[PDB]
Amino acid sequence: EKFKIERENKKDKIVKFFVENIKNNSIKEKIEKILAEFKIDELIKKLEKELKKGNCDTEIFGIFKKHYKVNFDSKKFSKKSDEEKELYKIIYRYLKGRIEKILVNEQKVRLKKMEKIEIEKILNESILSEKILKRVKQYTLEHIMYLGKLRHNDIDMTTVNTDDFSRLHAKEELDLELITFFASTNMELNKIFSRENINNDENIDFFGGDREKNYVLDKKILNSKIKIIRDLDFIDNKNNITNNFIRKFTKIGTNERNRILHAISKERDLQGTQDDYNKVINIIQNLKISDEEVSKALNLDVVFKDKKNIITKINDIKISEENNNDIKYLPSFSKVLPEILNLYRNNPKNEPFDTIETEKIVLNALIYVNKELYKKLILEDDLEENESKNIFLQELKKTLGNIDEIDENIIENYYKNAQISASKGNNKAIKKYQKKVIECYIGYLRKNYEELFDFSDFKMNIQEIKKQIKDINDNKTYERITVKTSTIVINDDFEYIISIFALLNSNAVINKIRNRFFATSVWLNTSEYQNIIDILDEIMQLNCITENWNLNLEEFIQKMKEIEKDRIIFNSDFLKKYKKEIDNLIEDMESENENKFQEIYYPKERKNELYIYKKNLFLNIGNPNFDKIYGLISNDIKMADAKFLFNIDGKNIRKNKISEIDAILKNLNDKLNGYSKEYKEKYIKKLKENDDFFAKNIQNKNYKSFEKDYNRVSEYKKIRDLVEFNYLNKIESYLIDINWKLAIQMARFERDMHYIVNGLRELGIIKLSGYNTGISRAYPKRNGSDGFYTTTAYYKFFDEESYKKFEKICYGFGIDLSENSEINKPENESIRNYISHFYIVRNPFADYSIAEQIDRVSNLLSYSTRYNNSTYASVFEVFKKDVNLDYDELKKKFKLIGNNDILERLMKPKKVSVLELESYNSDYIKNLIIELLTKIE
RNA sequence: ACCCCAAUAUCGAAGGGGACUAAAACUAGAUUGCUGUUCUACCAAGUAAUCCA
RNA sequence: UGGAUUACUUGGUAGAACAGCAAUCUAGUUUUAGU
Secondary structure, three states: OOHHHOOOOOOHHHHHHHHHHHOOOOHHHHHHHHHOOOOOOOHHHHHHHHHOOOOOOOOOHHHHHHHHHHHOOOOOOOOOOHHHHHHHHHHHHHHHHHHHHHHHHHHOOOOOOOOOOOOOOOOOOOOOOOOHHHHHHHHHHHHHHHHHHHHHOOOOOOOOOOOHHHHOOOOOHHHHHHHHHHHHHHHHOOOOEEEOOOOOOOOOOOOOOOOOOEEEOOOOOOHHHHHHHHHOOOEOHHHOEOOOOOOOHHHHHHHHHHHHHOOOOOOOOOOOOOOHHHHHHHHHHHHOOOOOOOOOOOOOOOOOOOOOOHHHHHHOOOEOOOOOOOOOOOOOHHHHHHHHHHHHOOOOOOOOOOOOOOOHHHHHHHHHHHHHHHHHHOOEOOOOOOOOOOOHHHHHHHHHOOOOOOOOOHHHHHHHHHHHHHOOOOOOHHHHHHHHHHHHHHHHHHHHOOOOOOOOOOOOOOOOOOHHHHHHHOOOOOOOOOOOOOOOOOOOHHHHHHHHHHOOOOOOHHHHHHHHHHHHHHHHOOOHHHHHHHHHHHHOOOOOOOOOOOOOOOHHHHHHHHHOOOOOOOOHHHHHHHHHHHHHHHOOOOOOOOOOOEOOOEOOOOOOOOOOOOHHHHOOEOEOOHHHHHOOOHHHHOOOOOOOOOOHHHOOHHHHHHHHHHHHOOOOOOOOOOOOHHHHHHHHOOOOOOOOOOOOOOOOOOOHHHHHHHHHHHHHHHHHHHHOOOOOOHHHHHHHHHHHHHHHHHHHHHHHHHHHHHHHHHOOOOOOOEEOOOOOOOOOOOOOOOOOOOOOOOEEOOOHHHHHHHHHHHHHHOOOOOOOOOOOOOOOOOHHHHOOOOHHHHOOOOOOOOHHHHHHHHOOOOOOOOOOOOOHHHHOOHHHHOEEEOHHHHOOOOOOOOOOOOOOOOEEEOEOOOOOOEOOOHHHHHHHHHHHHHOOO
8 A cells, every 4th residue: 555645756756866876875974873862771761760650551662752752843944855754654663663572572571581672782783773774775676676667567656556466466476486497407408418519518508599409319219209300300310400490490499598598578479370270289299198998998898798888878978167166065086985985795686706806896896986076066067958867966956955045055054054064063964964965875876877887797807807808819809898987179379388398397387387387277256267277287197119129138238239220219328327327226236145126127147147127226217417416325335234134034024014103093083173282292292101092093012012013114204215216306406496496596586686677767767778679688708798787688778887876776686787796707707607508406515615605596586575586495395395494483583605514403303103103214305405416615 | 575666856656466364075196014926046844756764 | 857949827026007995194275273
């Protein structure tokens, strides 16, 4: 409620005053010649006299305003201008905020904690002048960026609604993510290509300044990788490059990032763009990878041989695309499943079959039919004007609510009444509601079905020996009866470029931009980003040379074959690397009775004969950074025993004790729902010193026999992770998350350097400008000086004096645009090149710690006060998946390049259960996160 | 622990919001363990051929 | 008669495709209560 009741060319003439007076360095004298007029240190004395009573209430600000009336003339004794009156305003309101915070501090010296701040202990501080200059700078900076934001997005300022502080506050948080996604495809497409010459081992900018002689790299590319590019018509036979990188994928790539960075919402580009037959190629790639229902020969079409028309009735159930909100309220399939199994064991029309292994076939054929049926009876949508025996949900509303009540939310309101009754001390209400809905669905099933539960006719494993053997061994069986299991259309080029980018990145990068097309569409309540939110949901669900055209397990033969062949992509280099690393693991330096890696890496005949396939080793031989990541886990791998299969005490874990611990942790997650945490804590600690009421629980021997079994399953899962190489994925995950999270704020700074230039062009301070097309950088750099104010920036200036005045102003705010000042350092000593080109994943540990770059981005974003701790809070949420954060320590002020013993008080061992146990790999992943951030070698 | 709120250089704004705390269903994912069907490889016991007799 | 080139029977094991269940964590949506 600040801007649009004021600033009628009046705040503008105050900001225009403060800018050219911070430039001339005058406020740091004005502030003390003004604040000396405030008389202090007797007000402190009468504050001491009133706190000698111990008031801390509504009688103190009157004393402060009375002393203000003594000092400042409350009568209009003077004729000061609006600027100096606003300095008075800022100082008086800041002192008001400090005195209310010191009164809540005086409250917080006599309560149960005594954090002390004495009043006379702080005088020569921000009281005199430390932070009020920062306050004036933040005021002027917020108004300059506020002007430049509206100028950038070409908004008429007079017609600004408050609603456009919600329409536009979310369409650029999405654009930071759409720029950080646009540059992590620039590094993925540098692992495919390089330049024509061998000596260039750097990155290309495909999206921007284009260049010819850009050809394939014959390493690190897989058949699944090269097949996508070969199917997208990027490469032809003999691996040459087609002319779609000069007419189709280049031009459509650069225009999108131009329209995102420059915020050009002018029109659509041209009709000469990606038309529909250029999109059917990507449609074909999405078609030929998804699963076919005909390709499901594994729920065994011998269970429904004589019932081969009930599923035609199932497939004739009509559904429509409402995706209704009456699915949040019905309990899910996990609760109706035991009752459907018990209904199968209630039918008096079927018998004990042959034995215990005949009917597991039948149950695994039947649960897939019941699970897909439950989502077609709910979604059974609207109908014509003679439909008598009707849908499931109307009997549900008939059981919940009375008649003349069908067109009203009785399900929603009845769940809300059950939840209100739950919140008044009646914990049973939600389970009672779920049991009523379940018995309603059971009563609906028994009268319209159970002909599908009729298993009178049965073959007692007598012909299903060779029923499906004869069904597969014979071809042309067109009557593979299926389940339909409820189209991909791309509209415009934004969809067309994000889909191609989304089939070129890792499966965690799409979760970063799917959730941001989601949370933007929830914020605006629209449905514009709906064709993109589901194309990203079908590509996240897709995750030929597997064993046919793949691993022979005799590694002499295939390396010799693909040496003498010059399965073509299976280069002998990666096979020899895989060979060498497994040989490094299995070679017993302790050459004794020790073959502990048997059946894990080799099938009972080792030493260069046979080698078992592993996918968390073979999918890390190939990235160009492998041996740096691999070096700090390999000694931990080569020292863990084989307690897995060598003894009884590792097969009693794979069969019995894991399920017992899950059963104990499933009979408390249902006993302890809907209770406050004080009750759960006073019960969860009595479970530790229990001496008679663990026998009423699942196991016995109250807590020692549970913790020993938890320790044994814990060390089993310790050993399973490293021998399967389940830490070479966590490290790559951490590196790509940290580099993503730093490139976010490095794009934010590039946006704010547009807002600065626009907000100071409106104010007439950096006037006589111009627009230079093609280059997409806000400010000029000294790269190619003596005339650098014109060319190397999106905005042109007039003379060099205008750029020098602009640089003086930005240095006054705290943004240094000089030579070599952590911005214009030449290569990789600038933050803009080490992070906006993704070198934390491409080349780790190279001359910089990770924790020494978090500081260099948390200090480049220190010119604003709202960005305070916006990087220690944004980066350290990556690690909450594996360690606990201490947020009270993390909101404070610190640094990481020095300040020893700080990564131990900022993160804790992840203590996890609903019995509050500790995690199985807490210490190892904690020490591995600490050593990843700080290693310089 | 930060932002905004007036008759405002100042005059019960000597206050009030964002906000936290806890609990439900539903959705999506990662790891581990289990169940079912096909395909492949390895090891062990068995049935059935010369050859050495 | 024993070593030996053979074909298939179950039986541990291990990989790949698909379907289902349970535990732990993470992100989200709708909602309830109180301060």
